[PDB]
Amino acid sequence: GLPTELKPGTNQFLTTDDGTSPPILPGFEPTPLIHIPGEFTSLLDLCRIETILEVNNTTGTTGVNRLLIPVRAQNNVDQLCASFQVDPGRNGPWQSTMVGQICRYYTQWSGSLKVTFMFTGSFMATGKMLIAYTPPGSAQPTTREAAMLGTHIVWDFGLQSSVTLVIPWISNTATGIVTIWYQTNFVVPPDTPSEANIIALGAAQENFTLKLCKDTDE
């Protein structure tokens, strides 16, 4: 192909172009690649690793206390305990998760999330909480019975120490709500601390996706 014509696009440097270039040190042999454990080839594999939500991201709370949802003996029953949005890309509790940090490197994401709840009270500390999920259309429930009529899990401390809630689907181009309700009063025997903590963990599922690479805000 001796006779050639140079088409528009010559002598341009497109920073996303994936071409070849000469090796600067031809016949230089790099150190051979030994086996190193823990190779990762996908940010999605990291997105579905459970990491702690900072649900207590409240003004005046600092350090490890921001990772704890306080649970204590309530004078009034059916009171709300905690509320956070299901929104990895937005400012809030998901900022402290690995899925919430990777989501800030992408413009759009889709798929399901699971939120694990871990109760860290005494072995002899029984009671029920209601974990209710509100789909993005609907507003936050006002009462425990209002939240009970939607998607919810009744979680018993005495029986099951960790509960997992799967968020069905949520996307970014207004968002889901998770509320924790005091179903029953916090019950303890004598000589047992009457206030405990819940640790909320969050990750993505296998159907999570990310799209349109972008630089993070931090």
Binding site: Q12, L33, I34, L44, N91, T216
Partner: protein, 217 residues
């Protein structure tokens, strides 16, 4: 959408890794400059690279050179790569510019940018962003000398002061990337260049709200 969330694509595309300046007017009449290759020049790129502990990649470097007012005359330039552990130029006309083992690129401002691919240079099997140890004081802690990829000494091929400053934008594209041992994304501001040192004023990872029950910020 699984190709966009891969380590290969996360670390792809060419990014500015340094604005190198070849000053030759006013008081600075050096006519050359030496820029040490730093993959973590900017905090944005440093934070993305520190997501993993070990990496192995080949780097492709592009030089976008021009004058102060964006002009690109017929001036000749030499982009010499000084491999790790070679002596660097100490002047505009030192003998290090003639060393054959330092590869050079001779290119003009009028030509499209020069490109060249540096291979994986480390004596170890992978670049190591975190080294928990000492090479053999407090300063040397965390300082792995195996991450040095070399230098890019740049000069105008001239016998005297040209009187024109040349701005060189170095663009690097990480290629054939392999990463090991993922790590949490840095949350604190970076204070220094080679240390994980952070400020005593700890910043919260998550933005604040009025109370744990109010979905307003």
């Amino acid at each position: 959408g699984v190709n966009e969330a891969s380590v290969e694509h996360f670390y792809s595309r060419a990014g500015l890794v340094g604005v190198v300046e070849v000053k030759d007017s006013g008081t600075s009449q050096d006519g050359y400059t030496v820029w040490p290759i730093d993959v973590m020049g900017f905090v944005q790129q440093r934070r993305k690279l520190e997501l993993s502990t070990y990496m192995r990649f080949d780097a492709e470097f592009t030089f976008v050179s021009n004058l102060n007012d964006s002009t690109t005359p017929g001036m000749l330039l030499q982009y010499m790569y000084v491999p790790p552990g070679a002596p660097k130029p100490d002047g505009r006309k030192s003998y290090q510019w003639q060393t054959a083992t330092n590869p050079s690129i001779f290119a003009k401002l009028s030509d499209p940018p020069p490109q060249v691919s540096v291979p994986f240079m480390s004596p170890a099997s992978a670049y190591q962003w975190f080294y928990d140890g000492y090479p053999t004081t407090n300063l040397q802690y965390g300082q792995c000398p195996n991450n040095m990829m070399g230098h890019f000494a740049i000069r105008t091929v001239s016998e005297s002061t040209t009187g024109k400053n040349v701005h060189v934008r170095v663009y690097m594209r990480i290629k054939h990337v392999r990463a090991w041992v993922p790590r949490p994304f840095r949350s604190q501001a970076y204070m220094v260049k080679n240390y994980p040192t952070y400020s005593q004023t700890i910043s919260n990872t998550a933005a604040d709200r009025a109370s744990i029950t109010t979905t307003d910020y």
